[PDB]
Amino acid sequence: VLSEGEWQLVLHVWAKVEADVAGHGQDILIRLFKSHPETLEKFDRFKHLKTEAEMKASEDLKKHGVTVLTALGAILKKKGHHEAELKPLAQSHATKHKIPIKYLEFISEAIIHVLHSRHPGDFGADAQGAMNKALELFRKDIAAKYKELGYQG
Numbered sequence: 306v307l308s309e310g311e312w313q314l315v316l317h318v319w320a321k322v323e324a325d326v327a328g329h330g331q332d333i334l335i336r337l338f339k340s341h342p343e344t345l346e347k348f349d350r351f352k353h354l355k356t357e358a359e360m361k362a363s364e365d366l367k368k369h370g371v372t373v374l375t376a377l378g379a380i381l382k383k384k385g386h387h388e389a390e391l392k393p394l395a396q397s398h399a400t401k402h403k404i405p406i407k408y409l410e411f412i413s414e415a416i417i418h419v420l421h422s423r424h425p426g427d428f429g430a431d432a433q434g435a436m437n438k439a440l441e442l443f444r445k446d447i448a449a450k451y452k453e454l455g456y457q458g
């Protein structure tokens with residue numbers, strides 16, 4: 306469980322994410338796609354994009370980056386009590402999108418990278434630690450839904 310201390314750190318950097326969701330959402334998906342190319346193959350919708358410059362020029366990709374960060378933001382502000390929000394999310398990812406839990410680990414890593422680039426003084430070791438925990442709790446609750454459905458672990 307995150308402490309109320311750790312959540313404060315989490316929601317304090319998230320409030321600045323919210324200052325430019327689109328921006329952050331674009332950087333995050335691009336990092337994920339470049340670092341883990343197989344992840345791009347899960348999107349029929351963005352599969353055509355070949356270069357970083359193309360990804361950057363895609364307004365539709367920018368639009369999906371807000372969709373994603375918007376769903377994450379709502380979960381995070383629930384501080385742990387996110388079951389209604391998480392559920393539909395795990396359902397669609399396991400069963401429609403077929404996204405392995407491992408791929409959820411790579412986007413976490415992408416998020417924590419971008420946050421670090423964008424908000425140094427706001428994302429020290431301590432907040433990095435808190436965000437990592439929040440995303441592990443995310444991963445863990447989603448995993449328990451996947452196993453219940455007969456996907457991944």
Ligand code: HEM
Nearest residue numbers: 344345347348350372373376377394397402404408409412
């Ligand atoms: C922070 C983790 C993530 C969050 C909060 C998130 C959120 C969303 C949401 C809200 C949607 C639209 C509604 C729905 O279908 O659920 C969506 C669509 C989707 N997500 Fe995620 N997602 C996450 C991670 C991933 C990852 C890692 C992948 C693949 C590598 C993935 C693949 C997709 C695909 C294929 C769609 C369908 C989009 C479309 O074609 O319109 N998601 N995601």
